[PDB]
Design a protein around this ligand. Structure first.
Ligand SMILES: NC(=O)c1ccc[n+]([C@@H]2O[C@H](COP(=O)([O-])OP(=O)(O)OC[C@H]3O[C@@H](n4cnc5c(N)ncnc54)[C@H](OP(=O)(O)O)[C@@H]3O)[C@@H](O)[C@H]2O)c1
Ligand SMILES: O=C(c1ccc(OCCN2CCCCC2)cc1)c1c(-c2ccc(O)cc2)sc2cc(O)ccc12
Ligand SMILES: O=C(c1ccc(OCCN2CCCCC2)cc1)c1c(-c2ccc(O)cc2)sc2cc(O)ccc12
Ligand SMILES: [Cl-]
Length: 328
């Protein structure tokens, strides 16, 4: 039994490039009692990997989740053909004792892709759900500003906000994403790379300002949005992707006088905070919503484990519409 594994040859400087990654073919030992052999089906690439990769030693395996099928088993709880969520990192084949695996929701129908397990009915969906509903605390009738709005998390934020009856202003990096999100029904969508003035565009989009800011981007973009938050506005600090691949020091922070005078609340969160019943309910709500068409899905699928680095790099550079998935 062989595996293929993507390792970090060299720490990234700026954006990664191909020579930073190295693929190793490796032999797995046999199963011991109570272990299984997992075959990757779908693997995710995610922005957090750009940051978490800084903690690895050169030669280490890249971290990440996958949908896997059990192909050999000495574990009764896990027969062959069982589909699991697993986090062995970027590897085609792996050995588990079963304690680290997660079976899908029972009510998971065969009419949606298994890979939504890594997207809208998964971690990025949960991030959206908790960031917007608990961190921003959206009630109904609010104007929500969301950036990276065609991406895995932000696309879900916007749709959840719409179904709760909020006005949504979304920023994206391409005209293709603009048109996709308008078709979806977001109230205002613009391309932040081409508008003449971000400030003016944000003002035209919502003259009265913003109640909530679901921030995926940080940096200068956020400095500008902060200038148009309403008094007591709430910012969920979900991510800061404009800084993850940045070469120099960080950009200037936000103008303190504005943050103080507008009495802003800003809270960062990590999705893994919500566990047990709270998490299970969230997942069932997301699946429900997808089954009802209240949340549409789109995926950006890259074919072949050997292109996993390219899939990661393109997502960080904005290639993707919807969740970036690698099909094994
Ligand atoms: N628990 C947490 O707190 C948590 C969990 C998951 C994800 N996140 C964060 O959520 C954000 C979105 O994650 P995702 O998984 O849904 O990925 P994503 O939105 O599917 O993909 C990343 C998107 O980021 C945008 N982007 C990249 N560089 C940018 C820049 N300099 N300025 C503006 N936009 C830029 C690009 O879209 P554009 O074409 O629109 O530029 C790119 O498509 C990231 O900040 C991620 O770290 C946080
Ligand atoms: O805090 C996290 C983080 C926390 C837990 C994670 O879990 C990944 C492993 N996985 C979790 C559950 C299943 C088994 C393994 C991932 C990122 C994030 C960051 C961080 C900061 C400092 C650091 O040294 C490392 C990472 S950056 C980041 C961006 C995100 O979009 C999400 C989380 C994060
Ligand atoms: O990486 C983390 C993690 C990071 C920091 C944590 O605590 C930060 C400070 N810690 C607090 C207690 C005292 C020591 C320092 C806990 C988990 C993972 C999780 C986490 C859980 C809750 C939360 O709010 C944020 C993240 S869940 C998880 C699963 C993994 O396989 C690996 C990492 C993780
Ligand atoms: Cl897992």
């Amino acid at each position: 039994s062989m595996t293929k594994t993507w390792t970090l040859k060299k720490h990234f400087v700026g954006y990664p490039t191909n020579s930073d990654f190295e693929l190793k073919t490796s032999e797995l030992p046999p199963l011991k009692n109570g272990e299984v052999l997992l075959e990757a089906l779908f693997l995710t690439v995610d922005p957090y990997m750009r940051v978490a990769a800084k903690r690895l030693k050169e030669g280490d395996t890249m971290m990440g989740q996958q949908v896997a099928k059990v192909v050999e088993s000495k574990n009764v709880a896990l027969p062959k053909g069982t589909i699991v969520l697993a986090s062995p990192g970027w590897t085609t084949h792996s050995i588990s004792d079963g304690k680290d695996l997660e079976k899908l929701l029972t009510e998971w129908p065969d009419t949606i892709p298994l890979s939504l397990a890594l997207g809208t009915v998964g971690m990025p969906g949960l991030t959206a759900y908790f960031g917007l509903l608990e961190i921003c605390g959206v009630k109904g009738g609010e104007t929500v500003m969301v950036n990276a709005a065609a991406g895995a998390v932000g696309s879900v934020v916007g749709q959840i906000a719409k179904l709760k009856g909020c006005k949504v202003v979304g920023a994206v990096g391409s005209d293709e994403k603009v048109a996709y999100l308008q078709k979806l029904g977001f109230d205002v969508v613009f391309n932040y790379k081409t508008v003449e003035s971000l400030e003016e565009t944000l003002k035209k989009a919502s003259p009265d300002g913003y109640d909530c800011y679901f921030d995926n981007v940080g940096g200068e973009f956020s400095n500008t949005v902060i200038g148009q938050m309403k008094k007591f506005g709430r910012i969920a600090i979900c991510g800061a992707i404009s800084t993850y691949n940045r070469t120099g020091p960080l950009p200037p922070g936000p103008p303190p006088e504005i943050v103080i005078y507008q009495e802003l609340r800003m809270e960062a969160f990590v999705v893994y905070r919500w566990q047990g019943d709270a998490r299970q309910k969230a997942l069932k709500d997301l699946l429900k919503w997808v089954l009802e068409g209240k949340i549409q899905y789109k995926e950006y699928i890259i074919e072949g484990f050997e292109n996993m680095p390219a899939a990661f790099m393109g997502m960080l550079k904005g290639d993707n519409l919807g969740k970036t998935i690698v099909k094994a």
